[PDB]
């Protein structure tokens, strides 16, 4: 209850100046379920800040829902007082959306193309450069593509970084869907799944492509299993490997962007399991610190041994896996590098800034979005 | 004179004639009769199989008790199947009508017999309903004193809902407000008898039209400061007017359906003169829908257990007869009064229709008929 949780926020807040190099907060008109930075930074020559953009969404009680792009002023190399002349966050564009945005993810090869998960099971594809910044007041949603294959809403979504146009989606209907929208002109058309992998027997929580092997991807589901899939394989009902990853629901995974054999998964058993693709009968490690469910996990895009996780315990943990086995005086395992206690509600999503190391955006259920960055002496 | 089930004779004859009347007749017996029928916008065609997936929003109509809002999925054969239920949602009484919101098809608004207008989001309820029978709607819309049928979402203003009613009133909601109770933004008191149907105009956010047992067509504008008097007034029929439907392509053309068995064509630009009267039904008419594919195609249904399909371009053509020239097809598949029907938005000429004897038919007339 917000009783003790508030005591800790009062304490957290008073402590931020030398726990962080930057805390920015912004309250959204509606809560976002999804958060991902766009790769492209803009930096005017005159000013001493640079402009990044996020892909956010809405989750309303009713009303109208929108796909959102937001701009963030991030310092370059001044000094000032950082997060407290205070750098601004604005909405750059809303696009009418059929129901809440379960997730929004841009395409690595063309960052204008954005895919969203709707609750009507539909996956939609937008080019936001083809919609006005001010949404049509009719409230009607006009996607450039409509991807069909699912029966139920979902969350998991993943573009293939080495195969342009190939999109995978995960769902409550127990299925994974592949679309190849490559030869597909993006002007409204309906496209049906190329392939549907039926391995799992419960709700599929997430799926992600391997980052260097085009054929490989992995999904996780509420059936407590991590499955590694191959598209070469003609069998879509049984994946190449299968693991019992956790003792409760498996809600996310994220392949290591520097190390081709390493992935991690996040669950409802309050843990993050480190995995080695070369041998799945052995969990490498179990990061234990969260006190409630885990719903998101991301590798740092800068440093190969940094990992983050977030979920219901209203906290975002940042892990360093090289400090496995190190001795202590403890207040948690040595691999636990930082506890971000900035949110006073369950966190829905976070995403590392791809251009600004250690800068993280994170959003929670009480419409609070935080752009923040831990102080440098913590990782030096 | 009772015992007259002459109905059965003609169903026997009809069935024997389908091979040369339809490209597709599907029949299904519903667990209770459905009062309502509407296709959902979404078509799925799985990359392997020889059928496509469509879905309906149906309701139940029980006899004490337990009703459900129903989502059924329908498998339709391709150029080169069977119908099942996707999810039941507990409902306070019969579903007089179910209508999804265009801006969010997850959203469905229903009319109950209990005064209330309810708003559901079916993605927020179990596929397996709570056996308690309890109804927990996401919104409770208040304004009416009596049940109604007419219902219509605004295609050009997200979230705005119109309802028609027996209390003689029409109510407006924009649900973008605050247990889960929202009050009418506006109440249009124009009609003097039961209001039978209400529908938004398809391009103009401001205009809508209603029909009532006082035999009247009234056209409303929402900017108007007077909620006691509409922009126009027509004596539409020589009896009750039960439904209306604006032409999805011609902004001045609408149609009305009446207890007088006629379908009245109207021109908004001059309502003093009736454009046409489609005469062929042998009893009351309760539903009328424009085909969403062809600008000159219209369908109607009712008590005479039939569904007439009209093409209004063959109005005036010479013939030797057994009915008007504009009469394109008579669907005689039901052995009871038809409650509602719905054009398939993706498969041209395919129509769903539901009757008082729990029969749901997904069907399509033969192609040589409309060429």
């Amino acid at each position: 209850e917000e009783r003790v949780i508030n005591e800790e926020y009062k304490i957290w807040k008073k402590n931020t100046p030398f726990l962080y190099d930057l805390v920015m907060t912004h309250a959204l008109e509606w809560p976002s379920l999804t958060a991902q930075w766009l790769p492209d930074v803009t930096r005017p020559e005159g000013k001493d800040f640079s402009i990044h953009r996020l892909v956010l969404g809405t989750h309303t009680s009713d009303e109208q829902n929108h796909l959102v792009i937001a701009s963030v002023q991030l310092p370059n190399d001044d000094a000032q007082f950082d997060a407290s002349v205070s750098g601004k966050i604005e909405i750059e564009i809303k696009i009418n959306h059929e129901g809440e945005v379960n997730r929004a993810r841009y395409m690595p090869q063309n960052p204008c193309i954005i895919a969203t998960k709707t609750p009507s099971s539909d996956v939609l594809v937008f080019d936001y450069t083809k919609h006005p910044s001010k949404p049509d007041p009719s409230g009607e949603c006009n996607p450039d593509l409509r991807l069909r294959g699912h029966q139920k809403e979902g969350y998991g979504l993943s573009w293939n970084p080495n195969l342009s146009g190939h999109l995978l989606s995960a769902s409550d209907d127990h299925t994974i869907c592949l679309w190849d929208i490559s030869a597909v002109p993006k002007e409204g058309k309906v496209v049906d799944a190329k392939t549907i992998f039926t391995g799992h027997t419960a709700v599929v929580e997430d799926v992600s492509w391997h980052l260097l092997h085009e054929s490989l991807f992995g999904s996780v589901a509420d059936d407590q299993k991590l499955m590694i899939w191959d598209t070469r394989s003609n069998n879509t009902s049984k994946p190449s490997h299968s693991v019992d990853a956790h003792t409760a629901e498996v809600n996310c995974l994220s392949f290591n962007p520097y190390s081709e054999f390493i992935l991690a998964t996040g669950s409802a058993d309050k843990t993050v399991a480190l995995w080695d693709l070369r041998n799945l009968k052995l969990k490498l490690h179990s990061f234990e610190s969260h006190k409630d469910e885990i719903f998101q996990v991301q590798w740092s895009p800068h440093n190969e041994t940094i990992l983050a996780s977030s979920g219901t315990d209203r906290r975002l943990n940042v892990w360093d896996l090289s400090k496995i086995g190190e001795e202590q005086s403890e207040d948690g395992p040595p691999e636990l590098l930082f506890i971000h206690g900035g949110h006073t509600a369950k966190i829905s999503d976070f995403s590392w800034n791809p251009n600004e190391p250690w800068v993280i955006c994170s959003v929670s259920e009480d419409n609070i979005m935080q752009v923040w960055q831990m102080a440098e002496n913590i990782y030096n | 004179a009772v015992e007259e089930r002459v109905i059965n004779e003609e169903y026997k004859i009809w069935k024997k004639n389908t091979p040369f009347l339809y490209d597709l007749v599907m029949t299904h017996a519903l667990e209770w009769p459905s009062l309502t029928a509407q296709w959902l916008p979404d078509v799925t065609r799985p990359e392997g199989k020889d059928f496509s997936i469509h879905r309906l929003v149906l309701g139940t109509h029980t006899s004490d008790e337990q009703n459900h809002l129903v989502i059924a999925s329908v498998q339709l054969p391709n150029d080169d199947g069977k119908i099942e239920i996707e999810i039941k949602i507990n409902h306070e009484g019969e579903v007089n009508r179910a209508r999804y919101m265009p801006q969010n098809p997850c959203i469905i608004a229903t009319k109950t017999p209990s005064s209330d207008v309810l708003v559901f989001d079916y993605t927020k309820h179990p596929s397996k309903p709570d056996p308690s029978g309890e109804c927990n709607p996401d919104l409770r819309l208040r304004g009416h004193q009596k049940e109604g049928y007419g219902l219509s979402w605004n295609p050009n203003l997200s979230g705005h809902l119109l309802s028609a009613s027996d209390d003689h009133t029409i109510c407006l909601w924009d649900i973008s407000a605050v247990g889960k109770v929202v009050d009418a933004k506006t109440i249009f008191t124009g009609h003097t008898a039961v209001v039978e149907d209400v529908s938004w105009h398809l391009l103009h956010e401001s205009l809508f039209g209603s029909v009532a047992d006082d035999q009247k067509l009234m056209i409303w504008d929402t900017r108007s400061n007077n909620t006691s008097k509409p922009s126009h007034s027509v004596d539409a029929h020589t009896a009750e007017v039960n439904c209306l439907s604006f032409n999805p392509y011609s902004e001045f053309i609408l149609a009305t359906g009446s207890a007088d068995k006629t379908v009245a064509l109207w021109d908004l630009r001059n309502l003093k003169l009736k454009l046409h009267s489609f005469e062929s039904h042998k009893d009351e008419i309760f539903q009328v829908q424009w085909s969403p594919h062809n600008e000159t195609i219209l369908a109607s249904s009712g008590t005479d257990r039939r569904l007439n399909v009209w093409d209004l371009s063959k109005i005036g053509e010479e013939q030797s007869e057994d009915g008007p020239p504009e009469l394109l097809f008579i669907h005689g598949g039901h052995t009871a009064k038809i409650s509602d029907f719905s054009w398939n938005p993706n498969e041209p000429w395919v129509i769903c229709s539901v009757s008082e004897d729990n029969i749901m038919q997904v069907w399509q007339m033969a192609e040589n008929i409309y060429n």
């Binding site: 809560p31 009680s61 969350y155 409550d172 | 927020k124 179990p126």
Partner: peptide, 12 residues
């Protein structure tokens, strides 16, 4: 319905 998505979000 998931245990990831709230039942009733609030407007600010």
């Amino acid at each position: 319905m998931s245990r990831r998505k709230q039942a009733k979000p609030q407007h600010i």
